[PDB]
Scaffold this motif. Structure first.
Motif: not given
Length: 147
Positions: A53-60, A83-87, A111-116
């Motif tokens: 149920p966790v969804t994160s959308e990243f734009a870049g 796109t929502r919040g900080t991450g 090599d993956l870095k994820v924040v949030g």
């Protein structure tokens, strides 16, 4: 964290190289991803990542660091802001193509870095996520090549 994947595509290595060095072709085949535009030679896009149920959308932006055709190896840098919040997420993806006759074997080391919010998933979980998502990418790519 390090994520390692491998897949085969049903075209010879010269064809596979043309397809995988074309971000306008690759990005739309990735599950949850969409091409939004261009910035110079780089591609702008967004990806919705769903883990339960966790969804994160990243734009870049997606950018080639290196294309070594003589070795059939490419390095891609992808970065996106939530796109929502900080991450944010950032990946350096190294793809290596190998001859397999009528097909081509592709190894992908990231090599993956994820924040949030998505950082709650460790490398074991995200490796398993990556395998599921890569399976869908391959399915979509083989469906395209058939048409």
């Amino acid at each position: 964290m390090k994520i390692a994947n491998e897949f085969t595509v049903s075209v010879p290595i010269e064809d596979a190289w043309d397809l995988l060095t074309d971000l306008d072709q690759v990005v739309p085949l990735m599950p949850g991803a969409r091409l939004t535009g261009h910035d110079g030679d780089d591609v702008l896009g967004a990806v919705k990542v769903k883990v339960g149920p966790v969804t994160s959308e990243f734009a870049g932006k997606v950018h080639f660091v290196e294309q070594d055709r003589e070795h059939f190896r490419a390095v891609i840098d992808a970065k996106g802001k939530e796109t929502r919040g900080t991450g944010n997420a950032a990946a350096t993806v190294t793809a290596q193509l190998h001859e397999a006759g009528t097909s081509t074997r592709v190894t992908v080391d990231t090599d993956l870095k994820v924040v949030g919010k998505l950082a709650q998933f460790g490398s074991g979980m995200l490796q398993q996520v990556s395998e599921k998502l890569l399976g869908q990418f391959v399915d979509s790519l083989e469906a395209k090549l058939a048409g």
